[PDB]
């Protein structure tokens, strides 16, 4: 089976269009744009519940910097983020919402963008 037949640049130039789309979100985008801190958000149980914590800002720099090889693993990364926040946090929360928020213009805009890759 053929492997990596898009450069990293590809996929960036592909995907990076999505990954705007997710920072436009305003107010939604605001707990994402950066790693949870633990400390400052006074959850000390967060790093034990969530093993891969992923970010927009982590997510952003791999983009940018060509680190991802396929396209599903830009995909994987963004599902990782929405995930944690969702399994870490109750489903009232306002961060859970905000996260509901973000996965469904991510689905809204991948869909059309994973075509262009066919
Ligand atoms: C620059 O950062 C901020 O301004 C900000 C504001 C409000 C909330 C947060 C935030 O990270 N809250 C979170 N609490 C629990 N789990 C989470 N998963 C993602 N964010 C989560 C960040």
Do not use: H
Not at 19 to 25: G, S, V
Not at 29 to 42: E, I, N
Not at 49 to 76: C, H
Not at 93 to 116: G, H, N, T, W
Request: glycine share 2%; charged share 30%; proline share 8%.
């Amino acid at each position: 089976m053929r492997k990596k037949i898009f450069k990293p640049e590809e996929l960036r130039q592909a995907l990076m269009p999505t990954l705007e789309a997710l920072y436009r979100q305003d107010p939604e985008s605001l707990p994402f744009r950066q790693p949870v801190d633990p400390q400052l958000l006074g959850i000390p149980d967060y790093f034990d519940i969530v093993k891969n914590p992923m970010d927009l800002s982590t997510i952003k720099r791999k983009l940018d910097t060509g680190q991802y090889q396929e396209p599903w693993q830009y995909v994987d990364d963004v599902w990782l983020m929405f995930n944690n926040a969702w399994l870490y946090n109750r489903k009232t929360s306002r961060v859970y919402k905000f996260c509901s928020k973000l996965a469904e213009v991510f689905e809204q805009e991948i869909d059309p963008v994973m075509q262009s890759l066919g």
